[PDB]
Amino acid sequence: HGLDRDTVTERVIHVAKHFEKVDPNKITPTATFEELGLDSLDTVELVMALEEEFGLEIPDNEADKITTMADAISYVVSNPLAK
Amino acid sequence: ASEAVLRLPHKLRVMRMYRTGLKEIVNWSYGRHEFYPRANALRMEFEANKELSDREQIRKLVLHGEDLLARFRHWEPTIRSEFVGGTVYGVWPQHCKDVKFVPNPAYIDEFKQGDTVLLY
Amino acid sequence: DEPKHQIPGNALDNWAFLRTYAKPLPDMIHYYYYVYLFGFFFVYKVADFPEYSPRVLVMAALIGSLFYVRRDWVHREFKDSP
Amino acid sequence: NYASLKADTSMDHVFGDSTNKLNYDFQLMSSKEAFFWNYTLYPIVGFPIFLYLYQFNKLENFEAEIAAAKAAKAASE
Amino acid sequence: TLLGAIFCATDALYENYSGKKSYTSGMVAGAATGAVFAIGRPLPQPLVWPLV
Amino acid sequence: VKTLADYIHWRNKPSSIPPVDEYRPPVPLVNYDKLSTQFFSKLDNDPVINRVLRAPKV
Amino acid sequence: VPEPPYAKYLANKSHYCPPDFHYSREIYAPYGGYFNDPKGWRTNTAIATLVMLAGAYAVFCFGNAREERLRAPKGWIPSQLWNDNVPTPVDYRGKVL
Amino acid sequence: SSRIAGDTTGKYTPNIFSPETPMDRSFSHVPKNPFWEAWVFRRDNIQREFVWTWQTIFDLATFVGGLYVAMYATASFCSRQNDKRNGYPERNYYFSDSKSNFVIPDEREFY
Amino acid sequence: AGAGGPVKLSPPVDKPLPYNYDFWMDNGIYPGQPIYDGMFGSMVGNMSLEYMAKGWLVLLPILSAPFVYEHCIADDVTRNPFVPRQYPSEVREFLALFKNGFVLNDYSQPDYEEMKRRQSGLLTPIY
Amino acid sequence: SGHPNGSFWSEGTQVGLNGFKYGEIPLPNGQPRKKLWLENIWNIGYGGFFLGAFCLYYGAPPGHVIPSQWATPKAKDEYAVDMKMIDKYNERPDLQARLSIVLKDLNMIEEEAYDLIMMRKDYKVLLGLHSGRVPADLKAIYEELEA
Amino acid sequence: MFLLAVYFLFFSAIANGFFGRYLGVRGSQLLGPSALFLALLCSGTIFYEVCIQGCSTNIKLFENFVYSNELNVSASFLYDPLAATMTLTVVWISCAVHAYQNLYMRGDGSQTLFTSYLSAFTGFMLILVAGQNLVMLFIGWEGIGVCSYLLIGYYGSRVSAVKSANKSLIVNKISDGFLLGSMLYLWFYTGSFSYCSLATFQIPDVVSILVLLGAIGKSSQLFFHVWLADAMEGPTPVSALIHAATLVTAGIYVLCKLNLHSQSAVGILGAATALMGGLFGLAANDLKRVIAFSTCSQLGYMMAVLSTCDDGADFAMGHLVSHAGFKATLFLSAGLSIAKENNNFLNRYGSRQGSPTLSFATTIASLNLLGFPELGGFYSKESILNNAYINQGVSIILTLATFLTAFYTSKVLAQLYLFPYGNGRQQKSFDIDATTLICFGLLLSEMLLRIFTGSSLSQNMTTNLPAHIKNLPFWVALSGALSGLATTNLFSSNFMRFFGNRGGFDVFYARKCSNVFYHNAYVSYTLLDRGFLKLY
Ligand SMILES: CCCCCCCCCCCCCCCCCC(=O)OC[C@H](COP(=O)([O-])OCC(O)COP(=O)([O-])OC[C@@H](COC(=O)CCCCCCCCCCCCCCCCC)OC(=O)CCCCCCCCCCCCCCCCC)OC(=O)CCCCCCCCCCCCCCCCC
Ligand SMILES: CCCCCCCCCCCCCCCCCC(=O)O[C@@H](COC(=O)CCCCCCCCCCCCCCC)COP(=O)(O)OCC[N+](C)(C)C
Ligand SMILES: CCCCCCCCCCCCCCCCCCCC(=O)O[C@H](COC(=O)CCCCCCCCCCCCCC)COP(=O)(O)OCCN
Numbered sequence A: 001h002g003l004d005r006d007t008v009t010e011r012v013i014h015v016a017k018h019f020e021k022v023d024p025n026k027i028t029p030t031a032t033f034e035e036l037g038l039d040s041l042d043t044v045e046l047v048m049a050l051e052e053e054f055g056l057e058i059p060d061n062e063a064d065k066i067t068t069m070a071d072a073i074s075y076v077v078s079n080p081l082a083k
Numbered sequence B: 001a002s003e004a005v006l007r008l009p010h011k012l013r014v015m016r017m018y019r020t021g022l023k024e025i026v027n028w029s030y031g032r033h034e035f036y037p038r039a040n041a042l043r044m045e046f047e048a049n050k051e052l053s054d055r056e057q058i059r060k061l062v063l064h065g066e067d068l069l070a071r072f073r074h075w076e077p078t079i080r081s082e083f084v085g086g087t088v089y090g091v092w093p094q095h096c097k098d099v100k101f102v103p104n105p106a107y108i109d110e111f112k113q114g115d116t117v118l119l120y
Numbered sequence C: 001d002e003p004k005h006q007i008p009g010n011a012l013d014n015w016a017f018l019r020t021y022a023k024p025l026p027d028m029i030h031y032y033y034y035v036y037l038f039g040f041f042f043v044y045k046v047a048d049f050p051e052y053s054p055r056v057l058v059m060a061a062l063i064g065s066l067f068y069v070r071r072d073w074v075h076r077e078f079k080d081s082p
Numbered sequence D: 001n002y003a004s005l006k007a008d009t010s011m012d013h014v015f016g017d018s019t020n021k022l023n024y025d026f027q028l029m030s031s032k033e034a035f036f037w038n039y040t041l042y043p044i045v046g047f048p049i050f051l052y053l054y055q056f057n058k059l060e061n062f063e064a065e066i067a068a069a070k071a072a073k074a075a076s077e
Numbered sequence E: 001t002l003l004g005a006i007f008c009a010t011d012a013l014y015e016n017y018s019g020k021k022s023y024t025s026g027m028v029a030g031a032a033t034g035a036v037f038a039i040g041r042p043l044p045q046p047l048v049w050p051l052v
Numbered sequence F: 001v002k003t004l005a006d007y008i009h010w011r012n013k014p015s016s017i018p019p020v021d022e023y024r025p026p027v028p029l030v031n032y033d034k035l036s037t038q039f040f041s042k043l044d045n046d047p048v049i050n051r052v053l054r055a056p057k058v
Numbered sequence G: 001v002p003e004p005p006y007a008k009y010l011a012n013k014s015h016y017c018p019p020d021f022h023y024s025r026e027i028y029a030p031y032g033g034y035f036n037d038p039k040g041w042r043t044n045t046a047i048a049t050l051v052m053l054a055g056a057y058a059v060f061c062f063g064n065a066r067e068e069r070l071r072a073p074k075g076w077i078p079s080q081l082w083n084d085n086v087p088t089p090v091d092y093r094g095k096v097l
Numbered sequence H: 001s002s003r004i005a006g007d008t009t010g011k012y013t014p015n016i017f018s019p020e021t022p023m024d025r026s027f028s029h030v031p032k033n034p035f036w037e038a039w040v041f042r043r044d045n046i047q048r049e050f051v052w053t054w055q056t057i058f059d060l061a062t063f064v065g066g067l068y069v070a071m072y073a074t075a076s077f078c079s080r081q082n083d084k085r086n087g088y089p090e091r092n093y094y095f096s097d098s099k100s101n102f103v104i105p106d107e108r109e110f111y
Numbered sequence I: 001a002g003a004g005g006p007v008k009l010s011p012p013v014d015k016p017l018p019y020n021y022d023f024w025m026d027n028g029i030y031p032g033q034p035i036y037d038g039m040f041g042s043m044v045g046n047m048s049l050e051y052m053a054k055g056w057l058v059l060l061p062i063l064s065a066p067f068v069y070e071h072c073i074a075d076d077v078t079r080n081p082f083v084p085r086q087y088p089s090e091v092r093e094f095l096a097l098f099k100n101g102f103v104l105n106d107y108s109q110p111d112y113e114e115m116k117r118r119q120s121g122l123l124t125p126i127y
Numbered sequence J: 001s002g003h004p005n006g007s008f009w010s011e012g013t014q015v016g017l018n019g020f021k022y023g024e025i026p027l028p029n030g031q032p033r034k035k036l037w038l039e040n041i042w043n044i045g046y047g048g049f050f051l052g053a054f055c056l057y058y059g060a061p062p063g064h065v066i067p068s069q070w071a072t073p074k075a076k077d078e079y080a081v082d083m084k085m086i087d088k089y090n091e092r093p094d095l096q097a098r099l100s101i102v103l104k105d106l107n108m109i110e111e112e113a114y115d116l117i118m119m120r121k122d123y124k125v126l127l128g129l130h131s132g133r134v135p136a137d138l139k140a141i142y143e144e145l146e147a
Numbered sequence K: 001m002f003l004l005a006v007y008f009l010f011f012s013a014i015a016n017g018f019f020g021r022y023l024g025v026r027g028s029q030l031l032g033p034s035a036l037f038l039a040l041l042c043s044g045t046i047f048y049e050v051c052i053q054g055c056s057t058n059i060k061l062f063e064n065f066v067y068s069n070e071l072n073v074s075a076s077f078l079y080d081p082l083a084a085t086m087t088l089t090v091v092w093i094s095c096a097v098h099a100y101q102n103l104y105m106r107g108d109g110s111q112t113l114f115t116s117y118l119s120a121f122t123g124f125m126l127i128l129v130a131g132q133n134l135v136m137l138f139i140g141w142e143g144i145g146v147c148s149y150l151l152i153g154y155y156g157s158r159v160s161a162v163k164s165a166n167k168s169l170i171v172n173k174i175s176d177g178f179l180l181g182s183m184l185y186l187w188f189y190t191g192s193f194s195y196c197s198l199a200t201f202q203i204p205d206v207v208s209i210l211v212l213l214g215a216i217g218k219s220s221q222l223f224f225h226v227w228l229a230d231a232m233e234g235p236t237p238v239s240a241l242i243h244a245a246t247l248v249t250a251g252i253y254v255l256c257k258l259n260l261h262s263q264s265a266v267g268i269l270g271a272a273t274a275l276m277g278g279l280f281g282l283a284a285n286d287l288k289r290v291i292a293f294s295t296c297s298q299l300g301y302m303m304a305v306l307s308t309c310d311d312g313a314d315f316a317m318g319h320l321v322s323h324a325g326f327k328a329t330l331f332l333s334a335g336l337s338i339a340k341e342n343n344n345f346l347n348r349y350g351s352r353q354g355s356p357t358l359s360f361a362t363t364i365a366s367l368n369l370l371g372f373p374e375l376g377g378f379y380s381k382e383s384i385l386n387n388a389y390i391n392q393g394v395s396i397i398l399t400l401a402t403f404l405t406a407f408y409t410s411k412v413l414a415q416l417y418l419f420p421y422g423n424g425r426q427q428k429s430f431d432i433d434a435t436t437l438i439c440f441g442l443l444l445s446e447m448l449l450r451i452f453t454g455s456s457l458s459q460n461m462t463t464n465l466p467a468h469i470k471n472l473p474f475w476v477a478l479s480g481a482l483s484g485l486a487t488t489n490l491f492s493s494n495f496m497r498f499f500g501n502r503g504g505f506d507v508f509y510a511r512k513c514s515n516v517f518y519h520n521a522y523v524s525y526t527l528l529d530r531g532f533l534k535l536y
């Protein structure tokens, strides 16, 4: 089922909050992980946590291309198996 | 390490090691409860060596971690069912449109259907 | 387009090899005349040959077949040279 | 006419790209290894043959030894 | 003449040594003659000429 | 000595040579694929593995 | 794509068919379609049941004709109600019943 | 762009001049691939790539001739055992050199 | 949803095919497989045949240790603290006929030797 | 989900043709499809073959189609005779000794004694007795057991 | 009356598979279960007449099925005490599975064809069990083989499923080739194919080895167990039938029907299979695979018990019929769990609100598997373990196998119920209708009746053993259960990896046997007939 952008945005924002370093207002629908304060190893954990949230398996090469809040939402919206 | 992992840049190579290690923690666990402490332990294992700048030592750590991740590949990867390597992948694949169906086949030139021997 | 057999060799080199068969052709009567004469005399002499074992006869036939040179082979390879 | 040689990239992001290829050379077992494994497995297949050979040899040897002892006993006596 | 000499000599020598008239004398004489035929010849021919 | 053996087309050499470039089928990627040929290794009891897997309290 | 004229003769998607699942409706299979549920299924099931029971009656006659009991049962068996070739029961001690 | 060629009523005519492509038997033909066709051609004409090598001779002999030799030996052993079992004299088989003429048992005789 | 799930289609062949491409089984869905898994390509668990052979070399002596003692080291008199089941003569004679019987090991019996030779019977039919 | 009307015993939701059998399109007005040229000839010929095969397999007298059917009564009579003779052989030990001598000359083992009683009327024994291969005592032994 | 059950099953198969267009999905959902219910009544009558009241019957359908010279075989059915028991168990389990498939397979396209396959599958099992001669048994044997081929590969668009079906077919082909050899031996030297004249007190070893090699195929023993694990590709109703009664038990039934086995081979092979199956089930992480390895272990127990004593055949059959019940329950509950969680991996299962019936059925079946006292499985397993004490080597291996069985059974129970929820936060649901409840009620009734009626006549007969010897299996099972609940590590990572690869039996076949097979094919074709013998 094609899941709409608004819900995907809410759930990705919900996942991004759990990092302690990230401050709850810095996360916006269009923000890169660097401005949020996330490191590379942190981005791994965020991509994985997105995998549990939407019940999908991110193939690794696409996982590298996810570096921003925006493109993660775009990838989740693109996926037809995203829940 | 595979060729595709080797061709990757350093930053992405360490990222791959962390991702594969986390997935193998998931595979070797008995439940979600085991996952969190082991995930924190892997976190600390990577954080310990992040500030090293000596290239040769870093190469040693990356190679050893790659050997460790190669040996502890699980016989049974935990994969979601709808994805490649999953149980329900391809059970009843959705059939596409634009199918070439020949209506009333036996009534197209019914008397003269058959094989002919053509000669010079 | 269809799958086709690969032809070994270059086109011009193969054509050059084939062009070595285009040489002055003798008429076959010259060979035939000698074969007829020596064959007649040979048939006369054969009745006087000793009786040979069948095994030796077959081996002689095999050796003759192996040693026989086709007339085209001499045609392609003949050189008017020492 | 011919089928298109262009692949479909719609599902690459979901299920991964097709860039990674097989490492197999698509070649068979070496002749030396094949000789060993044929001449090992085929005897295992023919296990009744060797059982019959063993028992027949045993029977014939016992019969011949009986015959020899019989000849010895029937010579003196 | 050399090929025929090998053939006949090997045939007679084998029959004398064996003492019996058999197929094997002809096969061995032919094998020797075909071996002499293919001394320096390429790979199929060491097998085919002894056989023929 | 000219003989039939000289002009018989003996199969010493391949008439057809296969194309060099060959299709390798696509396969799902395994990141780390080195083979384990040693049943007993130091890697099983490596200090990292002990810290990552065996040590953490569950 | 505008559905072909014969699509009117073809039947619809059944209630059990998932809405997302697409199948070609023109394909004929003796075991049925992808989700079936034909109109008139109840009468067809009744006819199938009648044929099943009639064949059961014929098989029952055949088996009873060919059911051979050569050793007496230890006790009373249900077959005595319908088949008369059952030997009279004898118990473990040996007494006839 | 397509039309139904077949007519069950029997009023079938082939519209060779029709603008629309008939749905004839060629409608369902498989599209085919260039490289698959060349693979089929290569595989059928594999005699072109046949080369006499010592490895090839080794393989052919060891498997084909080896299996023939093994089967012949096993059959000869079975024939010998059956001759001992039946009580027949040793039979004159073709390549066995036996000084006995026994080939076919006499039905009338008791062995 | 069991039916209607998305699938990836395997790319069409675009390069000359190997002669032994029949070793690859592809139905059109992306993850094609060898004809027999483990014949070539990725190995499950990254374990080679050498590793499995070494593991079996470790296991077999321990697994075979219980069996070797009774079958080889032990003898009928010392295998068990009792004799086989004692039967009336008419029953015992019939039961001793069975080559796969359990009364053939009765060393108390005066027909022990013949019973043991019966137990170690013919490998193949003589006729 | 569930059942269409919530009741399992409700009318089917699918109206029309589940598929096109043989690929043929139903005629609009219900006009029957024109039959193929070979249908009548094919049905008549192959049905005739199968019906004739049935009739000949079952109608024909015994021994006409299945030869073993002819032998069944003869085998019953032979079975009765053999039963009587083997019963007599077991009772009389003098006959057992004589048949023991007969068996040895025929290169037969003693356990084949029942076999010889069962091959009284066969090519091998009948002609060997005439030729001299079989001892003439076997004739008397057969007669002493009522042939 | 005796014929009726096979008629009902084959009628269900023909009706659903050839006229399913008219019947429909609902039409299958009635005609299947109703016909098997009627067959269950007929099988109950058969069981009462033959087993309890000792009245065997022979039904000859027709004579001269094959009549070539002396070779003569007839289509006849003999319902002897073994056959009635296996028939009752098979029909009970198959009726349960047919009730199960009404809701489970509703989301599958060809539910009618699936029902038809299931019913013909049961019918061929009953043909195998009730045959009076070897040829009828071979007919049923090949029928169940082909039905397994058509059921494991039901999902044709999955390469793994079709390859699993091919694996099953090839392995079973080798096994029945050995059986056909043994059949020919027995006809030649006994004069008949019927089991009555089949009896030989002394048989040459070749016939015994051929019988054993044929039996170890369907009853998956060592070197022939590769297909059972891969048989998980098929739908869950298929797995329950094949592992519970139809396929695995057939070899044991053949070995019990004809006592031509040798004590030395059967005991060693069975004990090895039990230990290896338990060890393999230790590593497995799919719910369905662990239960298959447990099936392998139980088959090992049953094969081992034949060597112990004269009553070993009775004990093996009793464990067979007891095992069918709780194993079928375990597969059906596992399949329902997979549907409810949309998952096959044990890690992500967890505690969640569900039906009391399904959880209780899972608990009781697992308790029977473990050996919990005063249960049907407990008696049938202690009858084997206690009577195996005389064979010291067999007894030790079976006791370690009991420990391993307890460990992985308790681990599976803790992971399915006691463990916290491990799956994701998504809407997943499988609501169970009354038909599935009737299915599990039938299984639970079978389990309960097994306790009161027993499995073998000598089940409670005394084995004159010291108390500490007799009650030892309980202590080993309890220790295994306690270690499994704690989820402790038992083996090093190397041996855990070795067991996860199932001993590498398949990798050896891949690397040596298959490569030699296709090199023989290469020599035969490319080098020779399309090579040396092909013109330019
Ligand atoms: C100064 C004058 C010059 C001449 C000098 C001699 C003068 C004559 C004197 C006396 C003549 C009478 C006796 C001579 C032989 C009779 C032939 C004849 O006269 O015909 C007229 C002939 C011309 O006639 P034509 O019609 O114009 O030519 C027709 C051809 O197409 C011609 O066209 P082509 O040449 O282009 O094509 C040749 C073709 C023509 O075909 C033939 O030559 C047919 C010959 C077959 C055998 C003939 C019958 C043998 C029976 C002999 C009987 C005695 C022994 C009894 C027991 C033997 C049992 C078999 O054969 C070939 O392609 C080449 C192969 C040659 C033999 C083929 C058989 C091979 C078998 C070996 C197998 C081993 C290979 C295994 C590996 C393979 C790998 C896959 O004149 C001659 O050729 C005479 C030349 C004398 C040289 C012969 C050398 C040996 C002679 C005795 C050996 C017998 C074997 C025969 C060898 C080939 C002979 C042709
Ligand atoms: C013993 C006396 C009684 C005999 C009754 C036998 C039971 C039924 C026999 C019916 C005829 C048997 C042969 C039927 C045709 C064989 C083909 C077949 O069975 O199935 C066909 C198609 O099935 C049919 O249309 C007809 C089947 C009707 C009933 C079949 C019952 C099972 C067959 C019995 C096995 C034959 C025994 C032969 C060996 C003894 C193909 O199935 P799949 O390859 O699995 O693909 C189907 C699609 N899908 C991927 C979604 C699964
Ligand atoms: C047309 C026949 C030509 C043979 C074709 C075979 C294949 C050709 C390959 C060339 C190899 C050379 C020929 C050898 C063939 C002979 C068979 C070997 C058997 C053998 O060694 O026994 C000898 C007798 O067999 C014999 O020597 C006589 C056997 C006759 C040969 C077989 C005849 C039927 C073959 C037909 C096959 C199909 C035809 C297609 C070609 C020895 O006997 P011994 O008496 O010397 O005892 C020994 C006391 N010292």
Ligand SMILES: CCCCCCCCCCCCCCCCCCCC(=O)O[C@H](COC(=O)CCCCCCCCCCCCCC)COP(=O)(O)OCCN
Pocket (backbone or CB within 6 Å): D042, D043, D045, D046, D049, D053, H061, H062, H065, H066, H067, H069, H070, H071, H073, H074, H075, H076, H077
């Ligand atoms: C140029 C082409 C040829 C070159 C390459 C050839 C290399 C192959 C040579 C080995 C072939 C296998 C071995 C068979 C021949 C053995 C030597 C022959 C002599 C012989 O007959 O001895 C018998 C061998 O046992 C036997 O009876 C046979 C046992 C082996 C057969 C079973 C092994 C494979 C099973 C596979 C199935 C094949 C057979 C199927 C029926 C036993 O001696 P004896 O007591 O019989 O007395 C007979 C008096 N010499």
Ligand SMILES: CCCCCCCCCCCCCCCCCCCC(=O)O[C@H](COC(=O)CCCCCCCCCCCCCC)COP(=O)(O)OCCN
Pocket (backbone or CB within 6 Å): D033, I048, I049, I050, I052, I053, I054, I056, I057, I063, K222, K272, K503, K504, K505, K508, K511
């Ligand atoms: C409980 C009852 C028994 C259960 C089964 C037990 C089986 C035990 C057999 C294994 C133990 C002995 C193994 C032989 C010693 C070899 C030790 C080193 C192995 C080695 O170096 O080469 C290996 C050869 O494969 C091999 O070693 C294959 C030899 C196996 C003999 C056939 C026995 C059947 C085995 C079936 C299950 C065993 C799976 C593991 C073997 C790998 O070869 P490579 O691929 O690296 O070669 C390169 C390709 N050019």
Ligand SMILES: CCCCCCCCCCCC(=O)SCCNC(=O)CCNC(=O)[C@H](O)C(C)(C)COP(=O)(O)O
Pocket (backbone or CB within 6 Å): A039, A040, A041, A042, B010, B011, B014, B015, B017, B021, B024, B025, B028, B045, B046, B049, B050, B051, B052, B053, B058, B061, B062, B064, B065, B066, B068, B069, B072, F048, F049, F052, F053
């Ligand atoms: C199931 C068993 C699991 C197996 C686990 C085995 C895994 C082995 C783990 C130990 C191996 C290592 O430490 S591999 C550690 C390799 N060491 C280095 O790379 C030093 C240089 N570090 C950097 O360049 C960056 O800090 C970087 C870290 C890339 C991030 O970039 P960010 O600054 O932007 O976050």
